[PDB]
């Protein structure tokens, strides 16, 4: 016998799905009582309705065996039953998939498209996502009709090769996509940060060897490394992951603290030319008060930020990764036997709660990601 | 308009003592750093000396440095360059150039109002006058075709000296090759026409060459073999 | 002391064709680095005056590019007017400026026969007590086209001086005149003078000899 090994897998997983995402949506909450809400709450929110569409529709009737044995009740049941499995698989993934445009939109070109957002967990991408949802799932309606139920029906391949191929394959490819891209960027970005770390290094060793030269060369010398550095270093934009508008203390308060460096290394190499090495070692000390003022802040902030979208797009590309690894399990099945396919899947139940997995541990990685919910300890 | 303009360049015997002046339009010369760069006969560009006048900041080239001194006037709003002990390979023709300054854009352009350049030559020669010598073709050679018509212009210091076929009604087919300085000091230089078959055409060239510094000309003329 | 080696000493090129010049500095320095042209007799034109930015007056044709210390200047439509030397500058500091040897863009042509004529000395010259034999290379698109002198059936080296046309603009071709002077007792003891040059048009050297 298997049927009770089944009931329980599915009962425990209703237990840790619904605690999970019902203990951090709540959090969520709290920490939106706070000051301390921010954007992508609102897509961890809805990713977490989603988790508990997914428990309480297509999870709840089948761990109930005394309502899943024949799917006993007019046909009006088992039709909006069978839209609403649908309508929350479509979610699940569609929830992933605006997340991860978000981080693309929030990365590659973080702009002020956060139109019309809210702190009444809603926004312009997860309402598409959701409306989404629901129109793709309508044909649910117009197959299953107390058939116990069964599917009323070319029409079961083409029509599992269609659900697939939207369900899974298109936004699977398309999160594909935007995380090469949203990879390719966070390379760029941290590529730019080890240059400006390396030109400051570079100002570092040329001072300390101009503090410890006792000549006019290695000081007329070893102040042109210094300036070629400052002008590498203050051309250095912030990445994308900051704005760029004029006021801004990244275009005056960093690109006039390097103006000052620059001109105090010109002052440094004026008084080298002229064979007075010794005046020229107190511009060496001078420069440090310039570079600790405008510069060295900056290194942290940008080091510190990137650290940030690192970390949150981490978050995604596991959130991704687990998705794709719980669900292609269950969804290759179906395509690779659908067609009536070389033989019959016996095994159906352990892939889909396979699959229910994934929408399971989504609140874990979120609260093992976020600090925010990480320091929840006590509730 | 922006304008550099250089004057001083002329002859100076090795040894003695030039002076170059820079005179700019367009811009004071407080608001940016001039500099002197010189070309060699030719060869690429070399950076000699500069002047910021602001801060007094004179530079010069590790080829140069205690013999050039640069100065500047910004009421005449002229920079000067002294060179003393001259040698042989001062000789260039030297532009001068305008620099901005460091905090703005000024300084990311780079030289970018130059002058119309002073040519400098030093040497021990002394002005003199040319000799022109004939290339008679031989009717021999190439018996039937292309001929080649030439004279030859030798021992003339100063390099402006001009050649003309027929009092310059021959300009067509006419190569006059640049002056190559000869190891004793003045210039050779070789002028050559192409003429058809047929006899030549039946006409008599004559190679005229004058030469303004020494005010000589010369008729020379050219018969075949 | 940073050099600043351009590596294409000339390149030749024909008129819409792309053409790219190249530079390499010895220390790193930034962006400031800029591109000149000069044309015979005239003053350099600052093309781009950064590593990579068009100056107010230059025709779009002209980008620079920087890749670490590797910098390049590319025509993509070579006009006739864009025949002049290119000069790459490297200007990180007042005193530290260093200019590229320069590149020599040239109009291309199919390889032409060069015309070697020879002229003996002349008994004017003679009288002064000195003689010259030319050497006359005519109408040859390659520059490189070698010239020697044999006296008495023996190679001479070291006496002869060689001056080149700028390749005229009107069928874009050359002309080289190569003089070998001696003095009076030196000519007077030889019977036989001949020039023999060869060039890639020419299959085979060509010698022109006379006798005294
Ligand atoms: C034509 C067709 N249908 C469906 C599709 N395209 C979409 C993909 N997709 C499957 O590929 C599929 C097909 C069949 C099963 N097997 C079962 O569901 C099952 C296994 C053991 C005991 C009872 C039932 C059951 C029977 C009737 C209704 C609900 C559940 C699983 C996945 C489905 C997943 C979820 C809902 C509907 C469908």
């Known amino acids: 016998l298997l049927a009770r090994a089944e009931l329980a897998l599915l009962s425990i997983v209703f237990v840790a799905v619904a605690l999970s995402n019902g203990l951090v949506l709540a959090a969520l909450a709290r920490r939106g009582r706070r000051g301390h809400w921010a954007p992508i709450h609102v897509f961890i929110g809805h990713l977490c309705l989603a988790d508990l569409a997914v428990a309480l529709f297509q999870v709840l009737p089948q761990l109930a065996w005394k309502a899943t044995d024949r799917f006993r009740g007019p046909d009006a049941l088992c039709r909006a039953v069978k839209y609403l499995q649908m309508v929350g698989m479509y979610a699940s993934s569609y929830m992933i998939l605006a997340m991860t445009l978000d981080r693309h939109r929030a990365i590659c070109r973080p702009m002020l498209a956060y139109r019309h957002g809210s702190g009444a967990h809603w926004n312009r991408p997860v309402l598409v996502a959701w409306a989404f949802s629901l129109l793709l799932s309508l044909p649910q309606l117009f197959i299953f009709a107390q058939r116990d139920c069964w599917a009323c029906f070319w029409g079961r391949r083409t029509y599992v090769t269609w659900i697939a191929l939207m369900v899974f394959v298109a936004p699977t490819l398309g999160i594909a996509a935007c995380q090469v891209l949203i990879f390719r960027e966070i390379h760029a970005a941290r590529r730019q940060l080890a240059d400006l770390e390396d030109n400051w290094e570079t100002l570092n060793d040329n001072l300390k060897v101009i503090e410890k030269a006792d000549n006019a060369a290695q000081v007329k010398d070893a102040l042109t490394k210094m300036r070629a550095a400052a002008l590498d270093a203050q051309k250095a934009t912030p990445p994308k992951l900051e704005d760029k508008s004029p006021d801004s203390p990244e275009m005056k308060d960093f690109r006039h603290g390097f103006d000052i460096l620059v001109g105090q290394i010109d002052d440094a190499l004026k008084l080298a030319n002229e064979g007075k090495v010794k005046e020229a070692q107190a511009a060496a000390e001078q420069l440090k008060t310039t570079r600790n003022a405008y510069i060295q802040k900056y290194l942290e902030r940008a080091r510190s930020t990137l650290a940030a979208v690192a970390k949150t797009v981490r978050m995604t590309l596991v959130i991704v990764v687990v998705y794709v690894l719980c669900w292609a399990p269950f969804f290759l099945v179906q395509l690779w036997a659908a067609w009536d396919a070389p033989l019959e899947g016996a095994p159906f139940v352990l892939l889909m709660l396979l699959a229910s997995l994934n929408s399971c541990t989504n609140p874990w990685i979120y609260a093992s990601f976020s600090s925010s919910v990480s320091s929840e300890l006590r509730s | 308009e922006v304008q550099l303009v250089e004057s001083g360049g002329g002859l100076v015997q090795p040894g003695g003592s030039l002076r170059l002046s820079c005179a700019a339009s367009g811009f004071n010369v407080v608001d940016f750093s001039l500099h002197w760069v010189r070309q060699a006969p030719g060869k690429g560009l070399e950076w000699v000396a500069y002047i910021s006048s602001s801060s007094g900041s004179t530079s010069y080239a590790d080829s140069v440095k205690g013999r050039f001194t640069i100065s500047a006037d910004t009421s005449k709003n002229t920079a000067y360059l002294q060179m003393n002990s001259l040698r042989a390979e001062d000789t260039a023709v030297y532009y001068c150039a305008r620099w901005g300054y460091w905090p703005g854009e000024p300084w990311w352009k780079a030289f970018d109002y130059w002058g119309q350049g002073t040519l400098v030559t030093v040497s021990s020669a002394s002005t003199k006058g040319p000799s022109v010598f004939p290339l008679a073709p031989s009717s021999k050679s190439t018996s039937g075709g292309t001929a080649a018509l030439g004279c030859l212009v030798k021992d003339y210091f100063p390099e402006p000296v001009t050649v003309s076929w027929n009092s310059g009604a021959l300009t067509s087919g006419v190569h006059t090759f640049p002056a190559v300085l000869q190891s004793s000091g003045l210039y050779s230089l070789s002028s050559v026409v192409t003429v058809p078959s047929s006899s030549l055409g039946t006409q008599t060239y004559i190679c005229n060459v004058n030469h303004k510094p020494s005010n000589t000309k010369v008729d020379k003329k050219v018969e075949p073999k | 002391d940073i050099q600043m080696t351009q590596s294409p000493s000339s390149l030749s090129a024909s008129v819409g064709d792309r053409v790219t010049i190249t530079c390499r500095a010895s220390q790193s320095v930034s962006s400031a680095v800029a591109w000149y042209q000069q ?33 390049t200047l590319t025509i993509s439509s070579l006009q006739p007017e864009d025949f002049a030397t290119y000069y790459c500058q490297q200007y990180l500091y007042y005193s530290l400026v260093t200019f590229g040897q320069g590149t020599k863009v040239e109009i291309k042509r199919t390889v032409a026969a060069p015309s070697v004529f020879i002229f003996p000395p002349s008994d004017s010259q003679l009288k002064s007590g000195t003689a010259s034999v030319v050497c006359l290379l005519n109408n040859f698109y390659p520059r490189e086209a070698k010239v020697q002198w044999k006296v008495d059936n023996a190679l001479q080296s070291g006496n002869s001086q060689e001056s080149v046309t700028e390749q005229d603009s009107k069928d874009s071709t050359y002309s080289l005149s190569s003089t070998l002077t001696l003095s009076k007792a030196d000519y007077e003891k030889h019977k036989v003078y001949a020039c023999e040059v060869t060039h890639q048009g020419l299959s085979s050297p060509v010698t022109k000899s006379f006798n005294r």
Do not use: W
Not at chain 3, 40 to 56: F, N, V
């Open chain 3, 39 to 71: 044309k015979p007799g005239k003053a350099p034109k600052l093309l781009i005056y950064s590593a990579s930015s068009l100056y107010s007056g230059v025709p779009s044709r002209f980008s620079g590019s920087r890749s670490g210390t590797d910098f």
